[PDB]
């Protein structure tokens, strides 16, 4: 009964167990005559048998099945608008996977299935190359070149049934746009088989805002045309009468709080059956009812369309269950961070009641830390009890840190060999470590900041900072005072509200100024509470030890943070020396940036960014010249030189040069300028008032796949810097720097595209009220951080 | 050839350094997966993903021996090695010598190393590799016991007296012989004394009686 | 290396087992299974060169 | 000073459901209207505690706890309420 010559030649080439031991012919072959669905078409047909001839006896055995060559990783050459990511599931779903050989008759199952993947455009007959491989064996590679069958151009879009409105208003209200203007990029003719559910839902809600509750189609839709250049759209809208929405009565007890829901559900008499208001009134069970203890409410409302008196009313229901208590909170995914670093930005703890405004308040505070970006809410209910629900938050645990020696820009502060070894957030304890050892053309600023954001229970932060400036002010478009400074300060911040960031803390400040040029603006500070410096030479050393007390306040009502569209950012910064230090002064600085949008999609925002500041001595003394305010280039008033707005420098005529150079911005020299000597070098002032209006209208350059990076803006700046202790009666023939002078204003264009080598802040401006001594610049960019 | 790999089967990586015999394992499986001499090298995908410290990558082939070979004599033997590839994800090399306690972290990788050890002692009463797990499960017992203790430590720091008493009772039902229950007992009397309920607080009032440690 | 274990072999060291009692009175864990080792342990041996063939 | 967030402890308490409870009610009727308690005391018996403790910003703490003991059958549910904390 068992045939001995079932094994053939060449069958043990690739598979010796999947093509030889996958048949019941050995050890248990019972049927011999009607062997049609027992051996060849029962289990062996799935493996490698796709032939037609039945296995007969040995006297007429001429089967001789040859093993077909296998298939390798087929590289799809000629990728015409198709990627290799989505072109992967067409081989094992309906076809032959790797390992098993192509039997040269199931290739139609491989072929039919590639044209059934192109459903975004509607190619029902795609030119797929069904050819034979020239090479015989040894991991052959098929030839699969995909091409386009038809085009993707639409002819026209027409609408009928305009009984109350016009025709051209509905094109701009939809997502269809076939015209490109001179101020945008979009407006091309593109069709999609998945966008039909996007433009039709806004059509029904548009006419539902006019009282037409009987808005329905006449049993027809858009015919499916898979790009035959013969498309034809027809939407026959029907409208009725503008009804009037009456008052909404409360039917049933809404969890014992039905008396507080009537004052918001009731509307003014004379309002129509609005379409966008009935959607925004069914979610009113979470602002005051779902915040008590309820997690999963069920409230329905049916429309009572009464065409007799044109009065439509609605009845509310409630299908609430139990009190929906809260159980223990699980935190999964904390690999690189600890569990205690994220348990305080929640505002919803265990053994309490679930609030609707207690979950998203902790979700927006867990995402603003910057440790991860994938934050979700998995409110899983226990199957044992209908109460004591569990909440599970999602994390991502992304990395942070920076080390690199990226050179900066070259137009404001010169070449910057910024080292910047930014050792970021630590091993999980939540410690904002920061080191920035930069080196610009005029400074060598280094930092070491260790900030603990939660030193106390609720929100108090304690963090120190060590700095060492050692900056040379001759290269910062100033005159003199090459200053070598260092110090150490701590800051204990006390938040008083959800948006206020009041801070306090002491700090030591050391200063060592040398090579100071004799001038009237800075020697008035040295004359007050100090010795008379040597006017015969340079190198006038002056050491200063301070123990100032720093305070501040920050109002950060903002929505996005990176590119803000609505909100205000107020920041205050002040300091005052304690009695016991060297000098006695105080200074305050007020920053204000308000984003006001004038549209609904948050793309047309007016930015009223202002800037203030004031500082003076504490009676009988003067504010030091190394703490003055500066209005300069692309930080306060875009369109001028770096630190040029303010009072200029008038020098003292003496022979105080070291090796007697030609000028060195000093009178009484070999040139002969003895009396009435002045210059145009800014020295800063006691006060500063800078205001700027800005428009954030978008750019007509990039509208293809990204729009949240390029931020083209138009602005109009304004600024002035004056001194408060300048004598107006002692010095004649000089411009009086003792009053708020003429405002220096400018305007131009801006750009805030983020580059991979740091954020690029480009701002080209043109000065409008440039005066004497104020040098102006045009191209002011900023790259490298 | 089946003899070109068995001739160097005694020459493992004790003489070569890194990459002399790694690619020699992927030789016979690409030609025939049902050979008499090739069956020992085709089912070695769980070590080439494990040797290069790719611990989440090697976890995709742990469920292989359950479906194809249920009558193997080493089913009781492969239930121990599942904890070796899961406890490496529990503790990291960064917090190894820095003195950082890894108990206040995600215990998800500790339960994956526990579910195979739980079926090992309940599935077979007399196994062959169990006494090495007794020194290994005592490290997994005290690791996820100090996790809920740190949650109970934080709730006393905020003032949540109801939230802390639900965590210590979560440590009172499935932690009989760990170290974290010795310090969680003063956390019970602190929450009960701050609350007005004092019907049972006198029974849990005394803590330090004889255990002076 | 066929029968060999490499990578992070730092799981060999551990902490000793400590056993405490309930001196407060009838406070015993009664519901185990989700985080607790069962009451029995078993017996076995120790060694290396794990059979990693499924 | 520093502001305090909402510190809610225990389960919710309503003035209408706390009055309509008698002595000797079974565990099914108490855990149906009021719900399951968030306090589980396995010390000897199985007693239930219904604490209504909330702490808003800079207003101190409040507490309204209950003490309902049970037995193996679910009787002797004596009313022991403390609406005024000390």
């Amino acid at each position: 009964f068992v045939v001995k010559d079932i094994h053939f030649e060449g069958l043990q080439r690739v598979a010796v167990g999947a093509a030889l031991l996958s048949m019941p012919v050995r050890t248990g072959d019972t049927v011999n005559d009607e062997d049609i669905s027992n051996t060849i078409r029962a289990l062996f047909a799935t493996g490698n048998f796709e032939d037609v001839r039945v296995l007969r006896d040995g006297d007429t055995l001429l089967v001789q099945v040859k093993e077909r060559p296998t298939i390798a990783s087929i590289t799809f050459s000629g990728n015409k608008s198709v990627k290799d990511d989505m072109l992967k599931q067409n081989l094992e779903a309906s076809g032959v996977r790797v390992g098993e050989s192509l039997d040269r008759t199931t290739i139609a199952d491989i072929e039919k299935g590639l044209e059934d993947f192109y459903y975004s455009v509607g190619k029902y007959s795609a030119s797929v190359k069904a050819v034979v491989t020239p090479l015989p064996r040894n991991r052959v590679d098929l030839k699969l070149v995909f091409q386009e069958g038809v085009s993707a151009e639409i002819q026209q879009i027409n609408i009928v049934g305009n009984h109350a409105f016009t025709t051209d208003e509905l094109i701009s209200h939809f997502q269809l746009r076939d015209e490109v203007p001179w101020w945008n990029v979009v407006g091309d003719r593109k069709y999609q088989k998945q966008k039909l559910a996007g433009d039709l839902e806004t059509l029904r809600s548009y006419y539902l805002d006019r009282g037409y509750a009987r808005f329905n189609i006449d049993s027809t839709q858009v015919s499916l045309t898979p790009d035959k250049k013969g498309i034809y759209v027809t939407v026959n809208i029907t409208e009725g009468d503008q009804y009037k929405l009456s008052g909404v009565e409360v039917s049933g007890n809404l969890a014992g709080h039905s008396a507080e829901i009537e004052q918001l559900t009731k509307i003014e008499p004379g309002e129509l059956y609005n379409g966008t208001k009935v959607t925004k009134m069914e979610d009113d069970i979470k602002k005051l009812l779902g915040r008590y203890g309820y997690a999963y409410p069920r409230v329905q409302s049916m429309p009572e369309i009464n065409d007799a008196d044109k009065t439509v009313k609605l009845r509310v229901n409630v299908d609430a269950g139990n009190r929906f208590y809260v159980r223990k909170i699980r935190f999964e995914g904390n690999d690189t961070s600890k569990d205690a670093v994220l348990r305080r930005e929640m505002r919803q703890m265990e053994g309490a009641w679930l609030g609707s405004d207690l979950v998203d308040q902790g979700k927006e505070r867990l995402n603003r830390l910057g440790f991860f970006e994938t934050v979700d809410t998995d409110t899983q209910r226990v199957p044992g009890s209908p109460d004591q629900v569990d909440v599970v938050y999602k994390v991502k645990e992304r990395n942070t840190g920076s080390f690199c020696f990226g050179i900066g820009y070259g137009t404001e502060s010169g070449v910057s060999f910024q080292a910047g070894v930014q050792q970021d957030n630590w091993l999980g304890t939540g410690y904002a470590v920061g080191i920035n050892g930069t080196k610009n053309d005029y400074q060598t600023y280094a930092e070491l900041s260790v900030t603990n954001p939660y030193f106390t229970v609720d929100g108090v932060s304690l963090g120190g900072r060590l700095f060492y400036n050692d900056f040379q002010a001759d290269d910062a478009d100033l005159s003199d005072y090459t200053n070598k400074s260092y110090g150490t300060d701590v800051t204990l911040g006390f938040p008083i509200n959800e948006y206020n960031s009041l801070r306090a803390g002491l700090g030591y400040v050391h200063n060592s100024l040398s090579n100071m040029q004799p001038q009237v603006a800075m020697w008035r500070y040295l004359y007050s509470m100090g010795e008379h410096p040597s006017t015969s030479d340079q190198d006038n050393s002056f050491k200063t030890d301070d123990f100032t007390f720093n305070y501040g306040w920050t109002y950060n009502k903002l929505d996005r943070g990176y590119f803000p569209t609505d909100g205000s950012r107020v920041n205050l910064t002040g300091k005052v020396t304690i009695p016991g230090s060297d000098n006695e002064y105080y200074k305050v600085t007020l920053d204000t940036a308000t984003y006001v949008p004038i549209d609904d999609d948050h793309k047309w925002v007016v930015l009223g960014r202002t800037r203030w500041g004031y500082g003076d001595g504490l009676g009988g003394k003067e504010m030091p010249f190394y703490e003055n305010f500066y209005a300069g280039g692309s930080s306060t008033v875009r369109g001028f030189q770096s630190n040029t707005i303010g009072p200029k420098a008038v020098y003292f005529p003496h022979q105080a040069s070291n090796y007697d150079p030609d000028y060195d911005y000093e009178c009484a020299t070999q040139d002969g300028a003895k009396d009435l000597c002045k210059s145009d070098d800014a020295v800063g002032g006691n006060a500063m008032a800078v205001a700027s209006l800005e428009f954030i209208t978008p750019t007509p350059f990039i509208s293809d796949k990204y729009a949240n990076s390029v931020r083209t803006s138009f602005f109009w700046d304004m600024g002035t810097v004056w001194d408060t202790n300048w004598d107006s009666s002692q010095y004649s023939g000089y411009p009086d720097y003792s009053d708020p002078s003429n405002i220096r204003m400018s305007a131009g264009i801006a750009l805030q595209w983020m580059s991979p080598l740091g954020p690029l802040v480009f701002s080209y401006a043109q000065p409008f009220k440039k005066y004497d001594g104020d040098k102006a610049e045009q191209f002011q960019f900023n790259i490298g951080k | 050839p089946p003899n070109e790999i068995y001739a160097t089967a005694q020459q493992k990586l004790q003489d070569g350094n890194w990459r002399q015999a790694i690619t020699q394992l992927e030789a016979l499986d690409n030609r025939y997966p049902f050979g008499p001499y090739s069956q020992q090298v085709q089912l070695d995908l769980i070590y080439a993903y494990y040797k290069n410290a790719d611990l989440p990558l090697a976890q995709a082939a742990i469920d292989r021996f359950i479906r194809l070979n249920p009558t193997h004599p080493n089913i009781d033997y492969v239930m121990y090695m599942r904890g070796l590839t899961n406890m490496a994800l529990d503790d990291s090399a960064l917090q190894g010598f820095f003195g950082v306690d890894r108990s206040d972290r995600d215990p998800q990788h500790a339960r994956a190393a526990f579910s195979d050890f739980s079926k090992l002692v309940r599935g077979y009463p007399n196994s062959q590799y169990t006494t090495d797990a007794t020194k290994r499960l005592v490290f997994l017992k005290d690791r996820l016991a100090k996790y809920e203790y740190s949650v109970a430590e934080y709730y006393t720091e905020r003032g949540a007296w109801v939230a802390v008493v639900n965590r210590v009772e979560g440590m009172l039902r499935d932690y009989p012989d760990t170290q974290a229950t010795r310090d969680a007992l003063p956390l019970m009397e602190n929450a009960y004394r701050q609350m007005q309920m004092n019907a049972q607080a006198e029974k849990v009032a005394k803590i330090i009686a004889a255990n002076s440690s | 290396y066929k029968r060999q274990v490499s990578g992070d072999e730092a799981y060999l060291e551990a902490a000793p087992l400590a056993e405490l009692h309930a001196p407060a009175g009838m406070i015993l864990p009664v519901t185990s299974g989700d985080y607790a080792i069962p009451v029995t342990n078993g017996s076995g041996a120790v060694g290396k060169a794990l059979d990693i063939r499924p | 000073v520093v502001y305090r967030p909402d510190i809610n402890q225990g389960n919710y308490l309503t003035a209408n459901d706390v009055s309509k409870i008698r002595v000797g009610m079974t565990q099914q009727q108490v855990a149906y209207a009021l719900g399951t308690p968030l306090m589980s005391d396995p010390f000897g018996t199985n007693t239930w505690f219904y604490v209504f403790r909330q702490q808003p910003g800079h207003e101190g703490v409040t507490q309204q706890t209950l003490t309902l003991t049970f037995n193996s059958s679910g009787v002797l549910t004596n009313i022991d309420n403390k609406p005024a904390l000390s």
Partner: protein, 278 residues
């Protein structure tokens, strides 16, 4: 002095713009240049004969476009540049700002016989100030054009290490100084550079490094820059660089570039940006 170092500063501004293959456009070999997220910030110094010194910081920013054909890679796109040379030898102080734009294209064939075309136009405003010379301001507004044509082949010696030669001809229509205290003429610079590029690359499981080199040689044919006309130049430009793209990395190696003996010798142009995400 007047025509050797005071008015000959326009030739060094023209020589600070020409660069190598991967410096005028970036890493375009085996790199998908679809998005325009690239920036080439390069700083350095240079010194010539006669006590001359230069300090330039040339940045680059632009956007490219990828377009494939039948074996002919056509990568188009435009860019904008900005160069700030602090030329101050002994008597003056340069504060130029070479702000300009320009586009480029590629003709990468199958056998590595690429014909790269680069065209850019820059305009620099000078702010020279003659110290110890009794002069004032010398603000100019001259312009510069560039019509370079990069040509080169590629010899696949090894599967990981490649050897490629280079032959570029750079054309310009610069004017010079019009208010030299003297007029100028429209002379065309003919800066040409030949040489081979020694390449070496490695890879791994998920990381890849690149260790390039270079032994190019500049040889210009025509040089008649007069505002006295200039002479010929002959120098070698050794440029050894390194790059590495690991998944927890961006860059690792430096961008060393040194010039040989000649008229103007660029000293060093190290542009290392080794940072780390951990």
């Amino acid at each position: 002095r007047n025509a050797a170092a005071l008015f000959s500063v326009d030739y060094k501004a023209f020589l600070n713009e020409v660069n190598n293959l991967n410096k005028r456009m970036g890493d375009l070999r085996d790199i998908n240049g679809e998005a325009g997220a690239w920036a080439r910030i390069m700083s350095g110094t240079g010194s010539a004969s006669g006590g001359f010194s230069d300090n330039y910081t040339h940045v680059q920013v632009g956007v490219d476009k990828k377009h494939e054909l039948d074996g002919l890679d056509l990568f188009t796109g435009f860019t904008v540049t900005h160069t700030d040379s602090s030329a101050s030898a002994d008597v003056f102080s340069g504060k130029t700002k070479s702000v300009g734009a320009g586009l480029y294209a590629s003709a990468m064939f199958d056998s590595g016989a690429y014909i790269d075309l680069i065209g850019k136009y820059v305009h620099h405003d000078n702010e020279y100030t003659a110290t110890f010379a009794g002069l004032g301001t010398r603000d100019y507004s001259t312009h510069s054009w560039y019509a370079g044509a990069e040509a080169g082949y590629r010899y696949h010696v090894t599967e990981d290490a490649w050897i490629e030669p280079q032959a570029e001809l750079v054309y310009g229509s610069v004017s010079g100084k019009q208010f030299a205290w003297m007029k100028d003429k429209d002379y065309n610079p003919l800066i040409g550079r030949t040489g081979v590029d020694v390449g070496k690359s490695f890879s791994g499981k998920d990381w890849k490094v690149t260790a390039r080199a270079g032994l190019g040689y500049q040889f210009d044919l025509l040089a008649n820059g007069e505002t006295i006309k200039g002479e010929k130049d002959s120098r070698m430009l050794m440029s050894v660089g390194l790059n590495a793209e690991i998944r927890d990395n961006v860059r690792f190696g430096l961008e060393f570039e040194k010039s040989a003996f000649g008229k103007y010798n660029v000293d060093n142009a190290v542009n290392a940006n080794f940072c780390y995400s951990f």
